[PDB]
Design a binder for this molecule. Structure first.
Ligand SMILES: Cc1cc2nc3c(=O)[nH]c(=O)nc-3n(C[C@H](O)[C@H](O)[C@H](O)COP(=O)(O)O)c2cc1C
Ligand SMILES: Cc1cc(=O)oc2c1ccc1oc([C@@H](O)c3ccccc3)c(-c3ccccc3)c12
Ligand SMILES: O=C(O)c1cc(=O)[nH]c(=O)[nH]1
Length: 353
């Protein structure tokens, strides 16, 4: 542990939580990040942490999950924080406000958050122009092993969900290294067929990978159906998982019964187990980005061994601050060595073998 890590986790973040309501804290974090007002990320990525997947090189396997930079305002700051890849969004076709405030809640006793933002979004056009302003800068970053993902949502009032996602593919697909869609079976197949057709219609230099992001709350039937459709259609990857609408026994936070998705430590092993299941259902042939409750190297390695090629974190920033990124990377590198892995790649799915 560095001095910065301990200072942030033990002193600064608890103090700042006392001063800032959750959505204010989130907004101020985005602003600070976008301006580069960050502690030094002195951790230097080693070759051990490099991963090749989804048609790209990732300098390190620790990404920022969707929902932090919903509108593409802080991408460069997020790379400066040490993330190996950045996912923005969710972005909806038309701008929309989301749910009324308050809509974000901290459960500090649980190292958890509950949110019901409701896909607040500046909309595709605004984000398109924001990404266009730095498109060549991003091309260089991606070439250097720092890819960009875009998570596509749908508007609240949309009649045709597939058409909302198709619009996102057309508008932000050409600016992304990968796209994400959050998810009967025939209907899923029809939607993903439309998304992939739109993707395939982009010019080759502008053609992203397409991933499906799933919730931790799906039935066994749902998961078997998704695995089947993903393999049938050649979906490029899975993101496992979004937040949970479950409320695990043992939550202590006063706000535990707020409506919304639960993230952070109580989601962690639900997410890891869903990774394990999806890796098995897809025979290890479909790359998985593992996400949910990662706040340490052990957490990251458990997801990688369960089947994830990459991981993301988000909620841990609330409690550990920006130094958590270097913390997870340093700890992951140490554990890989301790467990006889040459690098991240050797550890992917190692539990299944
Ligand atoms: C405040 C907040 C907002 C989020 N918004 C989105 C979103 O817009 N799209 C999405 O796919 N996931 C969203 N997520 C889910 C995260 O991407 C991630 O899947 C989940 O929080 C689990 O990771 P974590 O425990 O490390 O936070 C959001 C999560 C939080 C906490
Ligand atoms: C969703 C959300 C809720 C929340 O209550 O706080 C959040 C939330 C989402 C992301 C967050 O990141 C930070 C922080 O680590 C940070 C990162 C980058 C720059 C500057 C600061 C806080 C943070 C900031 C201040 C006080 C408490 C927490 C935070
Ligand atoms: O905007 C939101 O409410 C949101 C979207 C999402 O995909 N996941 C989440 O937890 N919140």
């Amino acid at each position: 542990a560095t001095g910065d890590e301990r200072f942030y986790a033990e002193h600064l973040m608890p103090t700042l939580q006392g001063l800032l309501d959750p959505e204010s804290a989130h907004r101020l974090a985005v602003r600070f990040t976008s301006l580069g007002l960050l502690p030094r990320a002195r951790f230097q990525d080693s070759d051990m942490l490099e991963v090749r997947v989804l048609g790209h090189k990732f300098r390190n396997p620790v990404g920022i999950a969707a929902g932090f930079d919903k509108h593409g305002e802080a991408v460069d700051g997020l790379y400066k924080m040490g993330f190996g890849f950045v996912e923005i969004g969710s972005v909806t076709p038309k701008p929309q406000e989301g749910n009324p405030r308050p809509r974000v809640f901290r459960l500090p006793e649980d190292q958890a958050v509950i949110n019901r933002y409701g896909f607040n979004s500046h909309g595709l056009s605004v984000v398109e122009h924001r990404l266009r302003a730095r498109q060549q800068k991003q091309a260089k970053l991606t070439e250097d092993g720092l890819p960009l993902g875009v998570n596509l949502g749908k508007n609240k009032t949309s009649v045709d969900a597939a058409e909302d996602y198709a619009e996102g593919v057309r508008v932000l697909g050409p600016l992304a290294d990968y796209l994400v869609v959050n998810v009967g079976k025939a209907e899923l197949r029809r939607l993903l067929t439309k998304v992939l057709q739109e993707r395939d219609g982009l010019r080759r230099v502008h053609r992203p990978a397409v991933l499906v992001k799933i919730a931790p709350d799906l039935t066994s039937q749902d998961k078997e159906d998704i695995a089947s459709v993903v393999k049938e259609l050649g979906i490029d990857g899975l993101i496992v998982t979004n937040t949970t609408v479950s409320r695990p026994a043992g939550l202590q936070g006063a706000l535990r019964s707020e409506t919304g998705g639960l993230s952070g430590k109580p989601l962690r092993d639900l997410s890891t187990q869903t990774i394990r299941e999806m890796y098995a259902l897809t025979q290890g042939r479909v790359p998985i980005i593992g996400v949910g409750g990662v706040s340490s190297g052990q957490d990251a390695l458990e997801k990688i061994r369960a089947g994830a090629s990459l991981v993301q974190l988000y909620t841990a920033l609330t409690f550990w601050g920006p130094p958590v990124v270097g913390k997870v990377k340093r700890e992951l590198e140490a554990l890989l060595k301790e467990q006889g892995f040459g690098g991240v790649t050797d550890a992917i799915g190692a539990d299944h073998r």
